[PDB]
């Protein structure tokens, strides 16, 4: 077993999901969408942690980093931006001030430079393999959808998937399609469903965490 260091505040929620994974949840205030909750993932083992998506800004990012060090007794080994939008890179500056390396695909990094968003520092094409303690962490591209660059995260030792905004909560609407390739989105998530057939936890970019049924739902939503 592992301790439960979950907690809730007005600007930040951290919630245990499995023995070695935690959801982080922050909020992004827009004038065209309003206040939207945003999900990320923390996985850890052996004093090392990896985080998928920054919390929405530098202040909540700072709180998460300190909590990983103080409560989990882990060093944040890396942060991975799962696409170029601000609910993935908004807090990158705080990670960088802590000397925490940030990773994203080269496509994501080009997008962030073009949009003058904070830029992940280390690029890769299609797939990144990290270790947390002795545990594998995967981040990989399976096709376009919510954006042309979106990737997912997987922690196979506990079958936890961070789907990001490519994956919708059950009964969600299509959401923000401004950068989307909707015609291939079903095939992209079908590809993911085919390759992660025993996933136990699926975390959408926004909304309620569930199981593999979030893949089936997302495929339906964009297939009609």
| Active site amino acids | 83, 85, 87, 146, 165, 168, 176, 206
Residues 190-209 that bind Zn ion (CB under 5 A): 205
Q: Identify which of residues 37 and 136 has a Cβ nearer to Zn ion in the complex.
A: 37
Backbone angles phi, psi at 185, to 5 degrees: -55, -45
Rule CB under 5 A: choose which of 48, 58, 87, 144 binds Zn ion: 87
Cα–Cα dist 110/216, whole Å = 31
**Least distance (Å) from Zn ion to the CB of residue 56?**
10
Going by C-alpha positions, the residue among 101, 200, 104 that lies closest to residue 147 is 104
Rule CB under 5 A: choose which of 28, 128, 161, 165 binds Zn ion: 165
Q: Identify which of residues 24 and 85 has a Cβ nearer to Zn ion in the complex.
A: 85
53-77 in b/e burial notation, b at 16+ Cβ within 10 A? bbbbbbebbbbbbebbeeebebebb
**Least distance (Å) from Zn ion to the CB of residue 146?**
6
**Least distance (Å) from Zn ion to the CB of residue 28?**
8
107 near Zn ion, judged by CB under 5 A:
no
Instruction: Catalogue the long-range contacts made by 31-34 (C-beta closer than 8 Å, 24 or more residues apart).
Output: 33/176
Annotated binding site for Zn(2+): 83, 85, 87, 146, 165, 206
Residues binding Zn ion (CB under 5 A):
85, 87, 165, 205
């Amino acid at each position: 077993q592992t301790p439960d260091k979950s907690f809730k505040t007005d600007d930040l929620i951290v919630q245990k999901l499995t023995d070695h994974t935690y959801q982080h949840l922050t909020y992004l205030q827009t004038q065209t969408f309003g206040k939207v909750p945003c999900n990320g993932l923390i996985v850890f083992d052996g004093g090392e942690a990896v985080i998928f998506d920054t919390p929405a800004d530098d202040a909540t990012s700072e709180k998460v980093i300190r909590w990983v060090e103080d409560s989990l007794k882990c060093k944040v080994k890396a942060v991975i931006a799962t696409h170029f939008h601000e609910d993935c890179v908004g807090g990158l500056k705080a990670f960088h001030e802590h000397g925490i390396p940030s990773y994203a695909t080269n496509k994501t990094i080009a997008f962030d430079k073009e949009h003058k968003f904070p830029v992940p520092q280390k690029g890769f094409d299609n797939k990144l393999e990290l270790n947390v303690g002795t545990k594998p962490v995967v981040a990989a591209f399976y096709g376009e959808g919510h954006t042309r660059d979106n990737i997912i995260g997987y922690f196979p030792s506990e079958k936890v998937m961070f789907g990001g905004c490519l994956i919708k909560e059950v009964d969600a609407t299509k959401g923000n399609l401004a950068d989307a390739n909707v015609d291939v989105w079903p095939a992209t998530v079908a590809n993911i469903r085919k390759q992660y057939s025993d996933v136990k936890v699926v975390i959408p970019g926004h909304g309620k965490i569930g199981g593999s049924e979030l893949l089936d739902y997302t495929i339906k939503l964009f297939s009609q």
